[PDB]
Design a protein around this ligand. Sequence first.
Ligand SMILES: [Co+2]
Ligand SMILES: [Co+2]
Lengths: 158, 158
Amino acid sequence: LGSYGSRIEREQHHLIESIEKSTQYMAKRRIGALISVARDTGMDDYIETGIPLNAKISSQLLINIFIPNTPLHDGAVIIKGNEIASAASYLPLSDSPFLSKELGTRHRAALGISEVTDSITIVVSEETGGISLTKGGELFRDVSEEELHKILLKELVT
Amino acid sequence: LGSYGSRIEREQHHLIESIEKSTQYMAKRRIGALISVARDTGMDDYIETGIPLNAKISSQLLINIFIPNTPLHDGAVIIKGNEIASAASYLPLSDSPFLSKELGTRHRAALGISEVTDSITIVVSEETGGISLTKGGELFRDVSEEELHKILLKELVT
Ligand SMILES: [Co+2]
Ligand SMILES: [Co+2]
C-alpha cells in the first residue's frame, strides 16, 4: 500500500506494469504469449487444465514462461487474485465467423475466453509481434502502448 | 486405376504416399503440421471454418501449406474425397485429462476431432519433430515410419 489508496489498488498497478513490460519484451522478440486476467467470473475450470504455479506476479516470470520450446510456453497464463495461478492452460475457441483469417488459434482462443468470462486477455503474436486484447467478446488488434495502458487502467483497476 | 483393383484403391495409396512424404519432410525440418483425413462421418462443418482449396492431393502442396508465417500454415488441412478441401481450419479441442502436458494444443486438437468423427488425423510437432496420429479418441505418439504406414494402410484403404 504505497502512494495508492489501498493495497489492492497498488497490486493492480503492479499487475498492469508487469503485463506492459512483459508484452513489450515479448513483442520485440516475436514471442507468442497468452495472458488472461480473471475478474468477477472466476476461472477455476481453466486453471485446472494447466500447470499450477500460484506465483507472485512479475514481468520476468511472465517472460520466462512463454520462451519457445519450454515446458510452460504452450498454453495460457491465467492470473487470479494477486498471483499467476497457472501456466499452459487451454482456453475455449470462439466460433465467431468475424475473426480475421490472418489471426491464428491463439487469437481465436483469447476471443473464446472473453465470450464466456468477464476477464481481460492479452495476446502477443509470434508472426507479427502485434499486441492484442479481448474483453466481452470483442478483440482490439495491434494496439499501441498508449492504447493498451488506457484499457488495462480502465478495466483492471477498481 | 493402375496396378490396383480400382481407381479408388489407387487414389487411397496416393493419399498415403502424399501424407508419408510430407510428414517426413516436415518432421526433419521441425515444421508443425495438422492433417485430418475425413471418412464416413463427413466434416463439412470444419471445412467451412478454414480457407477452401479443393485442390489435388500432393506431398508438395501439403508442405507448402504448413511453412511457418504463411497465410495457410496456422490451422488444419482437411482432406475430403480425393482433394484437399481446406486449409487453416480449426478443430475442437479434447477435454481429456489424460493427454500428456508435454503436448500442446496442436496435439490436443487432433484428439478433439478424433472423438467426434471417425477420421484419421496426423500431427507433426514443431518442438520435437515427432509424428503422431489420432483415431477414435486415441493418440499414438512419436510413431515410426513403419508404424505410420501400417496404420494408414489399415485405416485409409478400403
Ligand atoms: Co508450441
Ligand atoms: Co502460428
